[PDB]
Amino acid sequence: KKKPLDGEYFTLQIRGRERFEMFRELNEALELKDAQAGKEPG
Amino acid sequence: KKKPLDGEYFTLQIRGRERFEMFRELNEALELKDAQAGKEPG
Amino acid sequence: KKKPLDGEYFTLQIRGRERFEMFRELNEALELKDAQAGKEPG
Amino acid sequence: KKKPLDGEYFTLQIRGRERFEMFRELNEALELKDAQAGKEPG
């Protein structure tokens, strides 16, 4: 949990509530793979 | 240009710069179709 | 409508019906912008 | 690995090679979360 200084952070306005939940999902999806991507080679 | 009170607006933090540009594109893409979607039936 | 030889075409299997409709939308969204992107400068 | 009869499968044509790799990524991303989604509650 050290250094939240990973990639520069940004913000984006998303109109619509249903659309928001959709983007949030794809966002967490990529973040999920990125978590297993930094997984040292077994 | 009257009433910016369309769908409720929201905000989302997106880590990574390359990823940001990507999401912005899909966002403008949907907004683009939405613009021609509200096009009265010729 | 000449030369369908634009970018090489590909195919992707998408599990789930609700998910399919979602991807199709983003696909048409980009294709929509691409149509106005090749719009000569007024 | 029993019953590949999960959600009905579909197919989508994606023009452009760079765009294809992009969609494939989001596809695997959702499939990745779906894998941990069916994870029994610890």
User: How far does the CA of residue D39 sit from the closest CA of chain A (Å)?
Assistant: 14
Q: How many residues does chain C have?
A: 42
Which among B7, B17, B23 has CB closest to A12?
B23
Are A23 and B20 a contacting pair at CB < 8 A?
no
Are C12 and D15 a contacting pair at CB < 8 A?
no
State the amino acid at position C5 in one-letter form: L
PDB experimental method:
NMR
Question: Which one-letter DSSP state was computed for residue B34?
Answer: H
State the amino acid at position A14 in one-letter form: I
Are D10 and C13 a contacting pair at CB < 8 A?
yes
- Count of structural domains, chain B: 1
Which CATH number does the domain housing residue C32 bear? 4.10.170.10
What is the torsional sign of CA B4, B6, B12, B18? Answer: negative
Cα dihedral D1→D24→B36→A15 (10° resolution):
80
* Among candidate residues B3, B28, B42, C2, the one with its CA nearest the CA of residue A19: B28
Note down the domain range covering A9.
Answer: 1-42
What are the residues facing A14 on neighbouring strands? B10
* Rounded alpha-carbon distances, angstroms, from residue C31 to A27, A40, C24, C28, D21: 22, 38, 10, 5, 16
Interface partners of B (3+ CB pairs, < 8 Å)? A, C
Tell how far CA A33 is from the center of its chain: 9
Helix (H, G, I), strand (E, B) or coil at C25: helix
Are A32 and D33 a contacting pair at CB < 8 A?
yes
Distance CA C16, CA C42 (A): 42
